[PDB]
Write a protein that binds this ligand. Structure first.
Ligand SMILES: O=C(O)[C@H]1O[C@@H](O[C@H]2[C@H](O)[C@H](O)[C@H](O[C@H]3[C@H](O)[C@H](O)[C@H](O)O[C@@H]3C(=O)O)O[C@@H]2C(=O)O)[C@@H](O)[C@@H](O)[C@@H]1O
Ligand SMILES: O=C(O)C1=C[C@H](O)[C@H](O)[C@H](O[C@H]2[C@H](O)[C@H](O)[C@H](O[C@H]3[C@H](O)[C@H](O)[C@H](O)O[C@@H]3C(=O)O)O[C@@H]2C(=O)O)O1
Length: 226
């Protein structure tokens, strides 16, 4: 009894350009499955036309992974001259108790390193400054450097919010409701890597492994320009 996001034509293109992973990195629905009405408790269309992702457990996910319409996985030069842009309208609800961080958008390399995570966090301390209930950008300092550079982007609101990630020429920028919140951060540490976008709910370090993280997307798309 779940309505498929594919029933809304605003999602047809991105679903044609995606596959769905759940609850780990195994694909449960390819683009053709998604376009043919795939729906489940963890991925469905709400009555007010949000594509909602929901998942419980440590490091579990319900996430779309960027694909080419050809069925090739997206694997663009992370630092190349072609601009790659992801845009999304996202409504982050109040997370259930025990949910401490939920990653909603990523630039991920073609191995095991997230270039960029945009995530909601219950708390974060960045150079002696503690912020509570915010949206955060985390950019890994390298494949061999586990550390990352973190930047508060927005105070969490339940309101629908426009996010835009623009990646071009060794730099990455993020806008939130049209306002630049991260201005050409350097990602040259991923020279020689290939990259792709992801969107959904990725549940990081919950304290209640039973609680559900939940994220709603009113619009979502990813493109390139040559
Ligand atoms: O505030 C810090 O910078 C904090 O980060 C700690 O390492 C983090 C790292 O910053 C980053 O958040 C990373 O993110 C993970 C993510 O949680 C998830 O597991 C994903 O699958 O992979 C991401 C990744 O590998 O980058 O998680 C690290 C973590 O240990 O939680 C430390 O550097 C810490 O000293 C520092 O205060
Ligand atoms: O998503 C993360 O932020 C996360 C960070 C960890 O440090 C790892 O990097 C981990 O990366 C995932 C990654 O996000 C993809 O889900 C990936 O999926 C691939 C798998 O190999 C699948 O089995 C499939 O065959 O192709 C997928 C693809 O590349 O699109 O798996 C890794 C991972 O779990 O190591 O998560």
């Amino acid at each position: 009894f779940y309505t498929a996001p594919s029933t809304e034509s605003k999602f047809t293109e991105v679903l044609s350009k995606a596959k769905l992973q759940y609850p780990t990195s195994t694909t449960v629905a390819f683009a053709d499955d998604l376009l043919d009405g795939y729906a489940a408790s963890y991925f469905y269309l709400t009555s007010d036309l949000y594509m909602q992702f929901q998942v419980a457990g440590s490091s579990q996910r319900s996430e779309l992974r960027e694909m080419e319409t050809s069925g090739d996985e997206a694997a663009w030069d992370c630092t190349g001259s072609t601009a790659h842009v992801a845009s999304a309208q996202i409504a982050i609800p109040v997370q259930e108790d025990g949910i401490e961080e939920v990653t909603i958008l990523q630039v991920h390399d073609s191995d095991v390193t997230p270039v960029l995570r945009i995530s909601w966090v219950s708390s974060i301390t960045i150079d002696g400054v503690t912020s509570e209930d915010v949206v955060l950008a985390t950019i890994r300092n390298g494949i061999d450097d586990s550390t990352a550079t973190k930047t508060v982007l927005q105070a969490h609101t339940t309101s629908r919010t426009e996010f835009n990630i623009n990646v071009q020429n060794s730099k990455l920028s993020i806008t939130v409701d049209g306002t630049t919140e991260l201005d050409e951060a350097d990602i040259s540490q991923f020279d020689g890597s290939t990259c792709y976008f992801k969107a959904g709910a990725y549940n990081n370090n919950p304290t209640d492994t039973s609680a559900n993280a939940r994220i709603k997307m009113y619009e979502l798309e990813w493109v390139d320009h040559h």
